[PDB]
Write an enzyme that holds these catalytic residues in place. Structure first.
Site, PDB file in Angstrom:
ATOM      1  N   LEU A 231      12.726  13.764 -20.652  1.00 25.06           N
ATOM      2  CA  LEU A 231      12.844  12.322 -20.462  1.00 25.06           C
ATOM      3  C   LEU A 231      12.563  11.929 -19.015  1.00 25.06           C
ATOM      4  O   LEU A 231      13.472  11.888 -18.182  1.00 25.06           O
ATOM      5  CB  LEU A 231      14.239  11.851 -20.867  1.00 25.06           C
ATOM      6  CG  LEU A 231      14.652  12.211 -22.299  1.00 25.06           C
ATOM      7  CD1 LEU A 231      15.986  11.561 -22.612  1.00 25.06           C
ATOM      8  CD2 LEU A 231      13.599  11.737 -23.289  1.00 25.06           C
ATOM      9  N   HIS A 232      11.297  11.641 -18.727  1.00 21.26           N
ATOM     10  CA  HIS A 232      10.875  11.254 -17.389  1.00 21.26           C
ATOM     11  C   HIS A 232      11.743  10.119 -16.834  1.00 21.26           C
ATOM     12  O   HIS A 232      12.011   9.131 -17.521  1.00 21.26           O
ATOM     13  CB  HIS A 232       9.409  10.818 -17.410  1.00 21.26           C
ATOM     14  CG  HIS A 232       8.793  10.732 -16.050  1.00 21.26           C
ATOM     15  ND1 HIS A 232       8.087  11.774 -15.487  1.00 21.26           N
ATOM     16  CD2 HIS A 232       8.825   9.752 -15.118  1.00 21.26           C
ATOM     17  CE1 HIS A 232       7.711  11.438 -14.267  1.00 21.26           C
ATOM     18  NE2 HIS A 232       8.148  10.217 -14.017  1.00 21.26           N
TER      19      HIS A 232
ATOM     20  N   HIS B 165       0.061  -6.795   1.517  1.00 16.61           N
ATOM     21  CA  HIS B 165      -0.306  -6.057   0.315  1.00 16.61           C
ATOM     22  C   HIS B 165      -1.811  -6.007   0.053  1.00 16.61           C
ATOM     23  O   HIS B 165      -2.272  -5.227  -0.776  1.00 16.61           O
ATOM     24  CB  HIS B 165       0.380  -6.682  -0.897  1.00 16.61           C
ATOM     25  CG  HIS B 165       0.664  -5.709  -1.996  1.00 16.61           C
ATOM     26  ND1 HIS B 165      -0.140  -4.618  -2.249  1.00 16.61           N
ATOM     27  CD2 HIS B 165       1.665  -5.661  -2.908  1.00 16.61           C
ATOM     28  CE1 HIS B 165       0.355  -3.937  -3.267  1.00 16.61           C
ATOM     29  NE2 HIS B 165       1.450  -4.548  -3.684  1.00 16.61           N
TER      30      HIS B 165
HETATM   31  C1  LIG Z   1       3.946  -6.327  -7.222  1.00 17.18           C
HETATM   32  N1  LIG Z   1       3.233  -5.806  -8.386  1.00 17.18           N
HETATM   33  C2  LIG Z   1       4.027  -4.747  -9.016  1.00 17.18           C
HETATM   34  C3  LIG Z   1       3.031  -6.890  -9.349  1.00 17.18           C
HETATM   35  C4  LIG Z   1       1.922  -5.288  -7.965  1.00 17.18           C
HETATM   36  C5  LIG Z   1       2.052  -3.871  -7.374  1.00 17.18           C
HETATM   37  O1  LIG Z   1       2.978  -3.879  -6.270  1.00 17.18           O
HETATM   38  C6  LIG Z   1       0.671  -3.421  -6.873  1.00 17.18           C
HETATM   39  C7  LIG Z   1      -0.337  -3.242  -8.006  1.00 17.18           C
HETATM   40  O2  LIG Z   1       0.085  -2.985  -9.156  1.00 17.18           O
HETATM   41  O3  LIG Z   1      -1.550  -3.356  -7.750  1.00 17.18           O
END
Ligand SMILES: C[N+](C)(C)C[C@H](O)CC(=O)O
Length: 591
Positions: A393-394, A317
């Site tokens: 309503l999204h 990530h």
């Molecule tokens: C996992 N989470 C939702 C906390 C972070 C997102 O995946 C990424 C972000 O919001 O920067």
């Protein structure tokens, strides 16, 4: 039109007005405070606005004057690179390849066949990127940032004693040469081969031979050293194990770089997760767990191949967000659909070099570290619980409020929620926080549980909740949110060695969610038939992700077993009931 031609025209990430941000902050803590706490907080915020905050904000503006994106580096470091806990399991996100919904149902013995095609399509996407033929993402006629697509291939993380770093070797044809080999992990061993031959990409049949030579080379023999398993460790340990592994042989650094520079890592597992349109939660579990021996958690993109011919992805990530992985996964899914999951081209298999193995030089220590790494990752992963289901309503706002009601009903208290908001309208824009647990949402929830409440009241309040959330999501994506803003002020102080403002020490700051304390960690993963997930943000928290199709909602929820109060399964059940209840309240209040 080229893929990255709009990058130099993207506007700078903005810095909200100090007063605007603080007002939104003050409003967000209300659901978690009584008269006194609130007045206390309001007092703190007012002094901040007038004193220290005003000065830190001024300094933040100066920072923005010299950076097209003032948050970029800080976010990468503080949200990912500096964190020391095991990232592979706790930060990496995973997503199952939805190919088993049509042409590739779970079925033993299809691993190498389908796998050859999985590589073929993935590699065609890479070629699409290298030639900048990938369509520019646009909102209406507004181009969106495409920088994260550079992190999909030839990108890998490198551990550090206190801070990790990201290595991005990808390059477009215009920029220069780009690594052309992929790395395959199998039975604790690592092999690599060039995906090109005589200038063009190798076909599936040829890709099948390459995976065949590797599979056999270590199929009738016990596992290998499993150096890979060390990528699933606490960041400092891994950093120490790496320096050591290298100190043993200056060449080990060369092998590590081979893996780091590869277009991506392809993992061959022997497990077989139950994957069917109805039950696939198991795919998520083995994706986040699995056998560390063949996973390279530091890789931005790690394609996972199981024995029953099922596929999944596990990504770091740190370098980018889930949308890039969703895009390629979807692209492949479409390719599978068009070809009915088959290769119908030439069956010829040109004489191309065989996969070369990366034989690391190790001793007794490394092997102990490897053994320990497996044990800690597997032990920690076993505490993970995943619940995945499909509601037929999204839409996003609808799901967010439904989650609010569901949590409120299950735990009897408002759940501070983090919802991701993309800010790609701006240069290298990544994300912003959307706080779903608003006053409106809570008042609506209460009315939903209020016997004396009328239908007109419930719908009226539900609608006000929607309006508030829609506005919030819009502002946040447009860079008018406040979470990243407050982080910047705090980081301006820290970077100059100045004390932490009282604002952040306030009990309400963290109770509302600040400091990574959201009991509900969520995000929409898109509208591309691909679903993903990550572990909660807090021990007593939930991870709730979902994607939206024009005919159904698909969710994936995570929770920790070691925490008796939470249950991912019951929450998913609860939200479905919430969807239903919200449906009736709309149809009934039709008149
Ligand atoms: C996992 N989470 C939702 C906390 C972070 C997102 O995946 C990424 C972000 O919001 O920067």
């Amino acid at each position: 039109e080229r893929t990255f031609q709009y990058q130099d025209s993207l506007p700078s990430l903005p810095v909200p007005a100090l007063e605007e941000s603080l007002k939104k902050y003050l409003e967000s803590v209300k659901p978690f405070a009584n008269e006194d706490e609130y007045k206390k907080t309001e007092e703190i915020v007012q002094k901040f606005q007038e004193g220290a905050g005003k000065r830190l904000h001024q300094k933040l503006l100066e920072r923005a004057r010299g950076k097209r994106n003032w948050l970029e580096e800080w976010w990468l470091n503080v949200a990912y690179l500096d964190v020391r806990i095991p990232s592979q399991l706790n930060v990496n996100f995973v997503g199952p390849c939805p190919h088993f919904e049509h042409y590739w149902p779970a079925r033993e013995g299809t691993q190498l066949e389908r796998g050859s095609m999985m590589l073929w399509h993935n590699l065609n996407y890479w070629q699409l990127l290298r030639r900048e033929k990938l369509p520019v993402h646009k909102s209406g006629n507004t181009p969106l940032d495409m920088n994260q697509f550079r992190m999909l291939f030839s990108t890998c993380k490198v551990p550090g004693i206190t801070r990790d770093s990201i290595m991005n070797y990808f390059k477009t044809e215009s920029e220069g040469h780009c690594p052309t080999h992929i790395a395959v992990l199998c039975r604790g061993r690592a092999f690599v081969f060039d995906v090109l031959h005589e200038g063009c990409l190798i076909t599936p049949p040829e890709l099948l031979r390459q995976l065949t030579y590797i599979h056999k080379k270590c199929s009738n023999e016990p596992v290998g050293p499993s150096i890979a398993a060390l990528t699933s460790e606490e960041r400092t340990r891994w950093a120490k194990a790496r320096e050591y592994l290298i100190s043993l042989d200056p060449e080990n650094l060369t092998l590590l770089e081979k893996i780091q520079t590869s277009l991506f890592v392809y993992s061959i597992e022997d497990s077989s997760p139950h994957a069917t349109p109805e039950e696939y939660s198991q795919v998520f579990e083995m994706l986040l767990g699995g056998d560390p021996s063949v996973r390279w958690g530091d890789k931005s993109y790690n394609l996972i191949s199981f024995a029953n011919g099922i596929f999944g992805c596990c990504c770091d990530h740190a370098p980018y967000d889930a949308m890039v992985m969703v895009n390629i996964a979807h692209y492949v899914d479409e390719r599978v659909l068009e070809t009915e999951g088959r290769w119908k081209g030439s069956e010829k298999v040109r004489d191309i070099p065989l996969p070369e193995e990366l034989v690391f030089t190790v001793d007794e220590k490394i092997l102990n570290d490897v053994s320990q790494a497996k044990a800690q990752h597997l032990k920690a992963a076993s505490d993970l619980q995943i619940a995945a289901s499909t509601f037929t309503l999204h839409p996003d706002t609808f799901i967010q409020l439904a989650l609010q009601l569901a949590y409120y009903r299950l735990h009897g208290r408002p759940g501070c929620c983090y919802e991701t908001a993309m800010t790609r309208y701006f240069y290298h824009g990544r994300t912003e926080t959307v706080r779903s647990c608003t006053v409106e949402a809570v008042r609506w929830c209460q009315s939903m549980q209020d016997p004396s409440a009328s239908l007109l009241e419930r719908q009226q309040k539900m609608l006000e909740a929607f309006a508030k959330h829609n506005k919030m999501m819009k502002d946040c994506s447009h860079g008018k949110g406040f979470d990243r803003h407050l982080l910047g002020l705090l980081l301006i102080a820290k970077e100059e060695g100045l004390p932490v403002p009282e604002l952040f020490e306030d009990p309400l700051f963290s109770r509302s969610g600040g400091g990574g304390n959201f009991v509900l960690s969520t995000s929409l993963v898109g509208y591309l038939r691909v679903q993903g997930v990550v572990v909660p943000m807090v021990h007593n928290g939930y991870g709730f992700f979902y994607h939206i199709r024009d005919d159904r909602f698909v969710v994936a929820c995570s929770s920790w077993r070691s925490c008796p109060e939470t249950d991912a399964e019951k929450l998913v059940q609860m939200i479905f009931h919430a969807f239903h209840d919200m449906i009736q309240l709309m149809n009934t209040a039709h008149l």
